Design a protein around this nucleic acid. Structure first.
Lengths: 208, 129, 107, 126, 82, 84
RNA sequence: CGCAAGACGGACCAGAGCGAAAGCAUUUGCCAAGAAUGUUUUCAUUAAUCAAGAACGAAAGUCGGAGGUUCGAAGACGAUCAGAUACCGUCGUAGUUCCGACCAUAAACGAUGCCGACUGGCGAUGCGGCGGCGUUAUUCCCAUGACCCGCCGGGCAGCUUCCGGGAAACCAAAGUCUUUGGGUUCCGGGGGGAGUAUGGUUGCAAAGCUGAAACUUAAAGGAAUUGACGGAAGGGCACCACC
């Protein structure tokens, strides 16, 4: 609980999550992530704590509200699985974007044409998106992040444990964030469900 | 092997605080370690500590805040003559104003301020600030 | 200034090992140091087997190999490009590689 | 080869195409006239060399989007294409097949669900 | 930083980490805090009214800022059974 | 080591994984048992790791042989721990 | 094809083992010995590190035998070169090998004293113990056994890391050093003269240990950076290069 009730778990969600196979977690734990871990499945794989994955995601959402100018929260992904994902998040919430080749000197370096002064970064893979995570730590900007069980914890305050091996796990978690932030300081009202199908987040890809 | 036990406890602490740690387990403890941990405590440089009783020599858990830049030990335990205390605090304290030299005198393990007030002296244990 | 943390080639836990003799200079180098390359090849070779298969009796048969484990001292293995100076960075890679397994249609 | 277009040329081609796509064409002869209208180019040989490379581009663009060029019309086309979604693919068909433990994942998650068991064998590293 | 007559001198009093109680000093721009929204209870309705934490360059470079937030957020809510 | 443990109350599971000498306050990781062999009805107490042959009260029997560690109890035998 | 002699233990063989270090790979037996582990065994401070003293100590050399297969410090030869006493070929020496004595030195390098604590991630591997309603191998079930996975010690190491160190190269120790203080031992104070003179000592000898000065001289030296340049490696480009 906390903030007081409704805000707790909802089977409906624990259903979307298990469905999207988030909790599945990496075989290599990593030490700073040990808390997330619920249990280790036989035949090596770890079960993330969805309850924990849930609450942190809400904690993330709340930090995204409280930024006044929504545009200046930067959602970021160079990973494909998270590219339409972040583009969607930016469409709904204010949130400006940074997909693909991050481009170095974007936070440091006025002169540049992708120069951004976010007040909050949200990253999807701390290993793939290491540049943005490093640049951010050159200029006092907080970081939400996509972390599987074995992701870099350096310079990331707030993790939301995922699966990020991929599928819809990256889709759902960006979805749920936007869903959550629109609820808070937004205007969804009635932490009731979605007119938006979560598939709308989710990776595209190729063609024959 | 071991010559002193204090020096280990103090170092262990210093590395805890340097890491960003908020607790430590020192081993093995002694009356002198307690007394020193205690002088530190009175002054704020650590939180509360706890002597756990293995059937051996003891183990202490210190909960530390982060007001501690450094707690050192002086070896050997040189004799000090009331106007060598003035010389010591200057050698090893940040400003005249604060930080303590803690020594052992006939009338107790004490910080040098308490020493000056009692008007006794002795052999130097260590310090902090 | 020390170049390879491994010094020569891997010892660490010894101080001694018997030396081998280079298969070229007939030099002398500790066995821990020394480039070693296995060498397995058919008795016959490329072109031969066809006359070797036709001229033989036996219904197939099916070719022996000569096996020889070579040793070179540093200067020979360099000289003959068994191994080649690698940049201050590339030297650190123990690994091994190429892209197909050159066995007939390679270089 | 011996004729490798230089940046001053190649740039102008990217340039015009970005602000000129629906105006420009397939054919050298006409863009060349167009470069007179839409740009101020100092020598005739340059303007020709420009018209020519930008046409080589238009010929290519009109056969597949080209690595660094964007025009309003191409954006609209990608936009429409980037809608697709069927009967939909998961289903997944009656009943999820689980690997169990993933069965024990739901079982100890307070969650009903469809079912199936086939999850056994270890399990080598490398 | 009092002076003679209880006056407050030098020029500023720095903020202190939310995890280590250690001065953020002053040019270490590899450090930042994190304003969490208060909620008008019940739920949603971001209402101000920040609940805020500041984390030091050190903790963050050591691959904490996150957890520290959680000890911070739960201990003072929200966040429970973390 | 992320600036998070309660050195004073550590978990029983990760206390139980640690070396006998590394335990918060030390303690052993060895135990005693009562052992059966139907023919007799009385029961010999035995130490988990043992070095000595241990023989039963009367019958020249066996009752484990020693090893690097825990004594290997012998075939058809039974054993309750066990106390405090 | 057989046999003799003397030599040596290939492939298997590793950033793998053991040993204080020097060093140590055939089988098998005997002889004592050494670490790790396990251990609710035993003692109650037994202990850390060390002038003096002492054990061991690759190679060559030296003393006397055995022995000399192999190869070969010297020599004599054939070539090469302007010169070649060399490299290169050949003949071939003491010697290599072994036994009993000497000798006490090797970039005897991890060029890194030894002992204790503390500070950081991951996966290997030798080894011990521990745990699994995991695999495979069997009999009627086994006791087996080898593995997979995890845990814990203590090995040699590796890998990645703005903790921190350092002049850097680098370094999880070379960290915890101006915020300079855990124990102890040793050596150095610009470079040459010099490991030289001289006395002592040890040595059969060859030599070893201890070890100056006069005089000489303003850099000796380290590390990184960059060119230039190479009979170093991949590179190219041109009939001022070849084809």
């Amino acid at each position: 609980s906390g903030a007081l009730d409704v805000l707790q778990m909802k089977e409906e969600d624990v259903l979307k999550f298990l469905a999207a196979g988030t909790h599945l977690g990496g075989t290599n734990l990593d030490f700073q992530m040990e808390q997330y871990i619920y249990k280790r499945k036989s035949d090596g794989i770890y079960i993330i704590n969805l309850k924990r994955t849930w609450e942190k995601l809400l904690l993330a959402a709340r930090a995204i509200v409280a930024i006044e100018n929504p545009a200046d929260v930067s959602v970021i992904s160079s990973r494909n699985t998270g590219q339409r994902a972040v583009l969607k998040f930016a469409a709904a919430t204010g949130a400006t974007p940074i997909a693909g080749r991050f481009t170095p000197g974007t936070f440091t370096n006025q002169i540049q044409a992708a120069f951004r002064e976010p007040r909050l970064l949200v990253v999807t893979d701390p290993r793939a998106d290491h540049q943005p995570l490093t640049e951010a730590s050159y200029v006092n900007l907080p970081t939400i992040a996509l972390c599987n069980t074995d992701s870099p914890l350096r310079y990331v305050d707030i993790a939301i444990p995922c699966n990020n091996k991929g599928a819809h796990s990256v889709g759902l978690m960006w979805w749920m964030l936007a869903r959550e932030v629109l609820r808070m300081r937004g205007t969804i009202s009635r932490e009731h469900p979605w007119e938006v199908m979560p598939d709308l987040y989710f990776y595209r890809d190729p063609e024959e | 092997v071991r010559m002193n036990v204090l020096a280990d406890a103090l170092k262990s602490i210093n590395n805890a605080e340097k890491r960003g740690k908020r607790q430590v387990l020192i081993r093995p403890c002694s009356k002198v370690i307690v007394r020193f941990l205690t002088v530190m405590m009175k002054h704020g440089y650590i939180g509360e500590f706890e002597i756990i009783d293995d059937h051996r020599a003891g183990k202490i858990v210190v909960n530390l805040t982060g007001r501690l830049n450094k707690c050192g030990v002086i070896s050997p335990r040189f004799d000090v003559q009331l106007k060598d205390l003035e010389k010591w605090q200057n050698n090893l304290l940040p400003s005249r104003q604060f930080g303590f030299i803690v020594l052992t005198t006939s009338a107790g393990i004490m910080d040098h301020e308490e020493a000056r007030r009692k008007h006794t002296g002795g052999k130097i244990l260590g310090f902090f600030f | 200034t020390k170049k390879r943390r491994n010094n020569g080639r891997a010892k660490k836990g010894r101080g001694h090992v018997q030396p081998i003799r280079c298969t070229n200079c007939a030099c002398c180098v500790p066995k821990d140091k020394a480039i070693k390359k296995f060498v397995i090849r058919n008795i016959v070779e490329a072109a031969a087997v066809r006359d070797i298969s036709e001229v033989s009796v036996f219904d197939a048969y099916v070719l022996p190999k000569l096996y020889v484990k070579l040793h070179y001292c540093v200067s020979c293995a360099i000289h003959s490009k068994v191994v080649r100076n690698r940049s201050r960075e590339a030297r650190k890679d123990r690994t091994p590689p190429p892209r197909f397994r050159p066995a007939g249609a390679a270089p | 080869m011996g004729r490798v277009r230089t940046k001053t040329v190649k740039k102008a081609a990217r340039v015009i195409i970005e602000k000129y796509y629906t105006r420009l064409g397939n054919d050298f002869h006409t863009n060349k006239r167009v470069c007179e209208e839409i740009a101020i180019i100092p020598s005739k040989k340059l303007r020709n060399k420009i018209a020519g490379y930008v046409t080589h581009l238009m010929k290519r663009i009109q056969r597949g989007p080209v690595r660094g060029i964007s025009i309003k019309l191409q954006e609209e086309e990608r936009e429409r294409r980037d809608n697709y979604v069927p009967e939909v693919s998961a289903l997944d068909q009656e009943i999820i097949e689980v690997d169990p433990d993933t069965k024990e994942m739901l079982k100890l998650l307070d969650f009903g669900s469809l079912s199936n068991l086939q999850v056994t064998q270890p399990t080598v590293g490398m | 930083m009092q002076s003679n007559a209880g006056e407050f001198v030098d020029l500023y009093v720095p903020r202190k980490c939310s995890a280590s109680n250690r001065i953020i000093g002053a040019k270490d721009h590899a450090s930042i805090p994190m304003n969490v929204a208060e909620v008008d209870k019940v739920t949603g309705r971001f209402n101000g009214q920040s609940k805020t934490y500041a984390i030091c360059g050190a903790i963050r470079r050591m691959g904490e800022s996150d957890d520290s937030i959680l000890r911070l957020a739960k201990s003072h809510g929200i966040v429970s059974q973390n | 080591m992320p600036l998070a443990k309660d050195l004073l109350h550590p978990s029983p599971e990760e206390e139980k994984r640690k070396h006998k000498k590394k335990r918060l306050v030390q303690s052993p990781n060895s135990y005693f048992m009562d052992v059966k062999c139907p023919g007799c009805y009385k029961i010999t107490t035995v130490f988990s790791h043992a070095q000595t042959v241990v023989l039963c009260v009367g019958c020249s029997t066996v009752l484990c042989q020693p090893t690097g560690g825990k004594a290997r109890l012998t075939e058809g035998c039974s054993f309750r721990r066990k106390q405090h």
